[PDB]
Amino acid sequence: REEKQLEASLDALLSQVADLKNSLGSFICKLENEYGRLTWPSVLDSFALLSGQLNTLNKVLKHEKTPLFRNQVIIPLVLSPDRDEDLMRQTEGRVPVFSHEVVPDHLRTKPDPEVEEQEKQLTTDAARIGADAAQKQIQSLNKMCSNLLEKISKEERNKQTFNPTDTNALVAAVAFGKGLS
C-alpha cells in the first residue's frame, strides 16, 4: 500500500484547494452586490480561514511521508490534447478541456515573478557587512512570552461572600435555646 500513500496525498491537497477556492468564490458573491456595511474584521476572518488552513495542509502534504523526487520522473501516458466527453470524469472540478496550442504561458510554477527577479536584480549589495545577525539570529531572544502564558490560568488547574456555617448556626440559636445550656 506504499503507492496508495502517495496517491492519498495528491487527492487530499487537491480536494482542500478546491474547497477553499469554492468558498472564496461563494464569499465573493456576497461581497460584490452588498458593497455597503463591509467591515474589515469580518472580511479578514474569511480570508484568514480560507488561506491559512489550505496553506498548512499544502506545506504538510509535501515534507511528511512523501516519495523520493529523484528516482521517479514525471511522464504522461500519451501526448494528445483531444477534447473527449469521456475524460471530464477524472478531475471533478477542473481540467474541463485540455488543448495544446491554446496556452503558451498559463501553467509554469504559477508564473508571478516577484522573488527570483528581485534576487537577480539585487544579487550583490552586501559582501561583509552582516551575515551574522541573519543566520545566527535564532538565539537572540528565544523565549520572551512562552513562559508567562501557561502560569496564569492553566497552572491553577475568588473572595467568599457567604458563610454556610453561620447560616445554620444562627437559625438554630434564634428559635430557642438549643445549644445554650
Binding site: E7, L10, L13, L14, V17, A18, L20, K21, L24, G25, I28, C29, L31, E32, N33, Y35, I74, P76, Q90, T91, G93, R94, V95, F98, H106, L107, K110, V115, E116, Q118, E119, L122, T123, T124, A134
Partner: protein, 106 residues
Amino acid sequence: WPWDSVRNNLRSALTEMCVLYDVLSIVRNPQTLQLISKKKSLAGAAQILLKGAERLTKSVTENQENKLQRDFNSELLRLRQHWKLRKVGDKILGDLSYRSAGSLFP
C-alpha cells in the same frame, strides 16, 4: 470596483486550482532569497504595528487632549449619573415617568 476586484480574485483562484489539478493529473549560492523575504515580512509587520498604533492614538485621542461632547463614555454618563441607570428595552434607558411614585398611568 468591488465587483471587478472580486471577479479578478475569483479568476485568480480558479486559475490556481486549475494549475494545481493539472499538475496533479500529470504527476499521476549567494542568493539569500529567504533572507530578503524575511526582511520584507519584518518590514511589513513593523508597518502594520505602526499603522495600528497610529489608528489607536488618532481615533481614541478625543478625550485625551480635551474633554468635548462625545457620546462615547463622555456624554451618556453625564445625563445617566444625573437621571437614571443602565436599562435596555431595545436601546432605551431610564424613561422619566415618575413611576417611582406615580401609580397613575404608564
